[PDB]
Amino acid sequence: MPNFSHTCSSINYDPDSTILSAECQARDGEWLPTELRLSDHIGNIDGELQFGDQNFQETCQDCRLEFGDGEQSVWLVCTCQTMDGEWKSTQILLDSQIDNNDSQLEIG
Numbered sequence: 001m002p003n004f005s006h007t008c009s010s011i012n013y014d015p016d017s018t019i020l021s022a023e024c025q026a027r028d029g030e031w032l033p034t035e036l037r038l039s040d041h042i043g044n045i046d047g048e049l050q051f052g053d054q055n056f057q058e059t060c061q062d063c064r065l066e067f068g069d070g071e072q073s074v075w076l077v078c079t080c081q082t083m084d085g086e087w088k089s090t091q092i093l094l095d096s097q098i099d100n101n102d103s104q105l106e107i108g
């Protein structure tokens, strides 16, 4: 269902504190800024990235968003260390079971 793309603009993601910042329009038509911490639903699992877990940037580096053919989407890729200590590249699409209300930001 709907995502924070068209509803919000100026998608920012700091790789240190992993916080997503973007301006969204409220029901009153007013524009406000919102922040979100993915670490809450993203953790490391034997070298892979999955939803439901937490604490991932601590064991991962080079996190960066990537725009596809249409700037209406950005994709999250990060290198996460494995339990043996090896480094591997994983990928994950934020667009999915996540959405933002007109004036509030909460999972759908």
Ligand SMILES: OC[C@H]1O[C@H](O[C@H]2[C@@H](O)[C@H](O)[C@@H](CO)O[C@@H]2O)[C@@H](O)[C@@H](O)[C@@H]1O
Residues within 6 Å of the ligand: 043, 044, 045, 046, 047, 053, 054, 055, 056, 058, 059, 081, 082, 083, 084, 085
């Ligand atoms: O911050 C603790 C860390 O613990 C768990 O991760 C394990 C493993 O996947 C990691 O590769 C190594 C460190 O490189 O540590 C543990 O053995 C996870 O619960 C992870 O989410 C958490 O951040």
